[PDB]
C-alpha cells in the first residue's frame, strides 16, 4: 500500500493505492473525485511526468517514503484543451517562526 497527496493548485487528495497498482487506477480515483478525464491529467513526481504504463512502485513511490503518517506528494495538472498547464502546487502555509531557545540573544 502507498499513500499520496494528489495536489494540483490547492486541492489535496488524501488517497491510498497499492504499490503494485498502476497510474491508471490513480487517474480513475481522480475521475471518481474531480470528475475529470485521465487524458486531461498529467501527474508529476517532483517535476517528472508519470507515464500511464508504469506502476506506482516503479516510479519512486514505495511503502517506506509514502507512509500513512507522511504521504508523498504528487502533482496534478489539467489540460483545458490548450497545451495542458504547468505544475502550480501552492505550499500550505508557514508555521509560526519558533526560534531556537539556545540561540544567543
Amino acid at each position: 500500500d502507498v499513500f499520496l497527496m494528489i495536489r494540483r493548485h490547492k486541492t489535496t487528495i488524501f488517497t491510498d493505492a497499492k504499490e503494485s497498482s498502476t497510474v491508471f487506477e490513480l487517474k480513475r480515483i481522480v475521475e471518481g473525485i474531480l470528475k475529470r478525464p485521465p487524458d486531461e491529467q498529467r501527474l508529476y513526481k517532483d517535476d517528472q511526468l508519470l507515464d500511464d504504463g508504469k506502476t506506482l512502485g516503479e516510479c519512486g513511490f514505495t511503502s517506506q517514503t509514502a507512509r500513512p503518517q507522511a504521504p508523498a506528494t504528487v502533482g496534478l495538472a489539467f489540460r483545458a484543451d490548450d497545451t495542458f498547464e504547468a505544475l502550480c502546487i501552492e505550499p500550505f502555509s508557514s508555521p509560526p517562526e519558533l526560534p531556537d531557545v539556545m540561540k544567543p540573544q
Binding site: 488524501f14 500513512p68 502555509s93
Partner: peptide
C-alpha cells in the same frame, strides 16, 4: 490553517 489541517488529514489516514 492549511498547514495544520494537512497534518489533521494525515492523522485521519494514519
Amino acid at each position: 490553517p492549511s498547514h495544520v489541517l494537512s497534518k489533521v488529514c494525515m492523522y485521519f489516514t494514519y
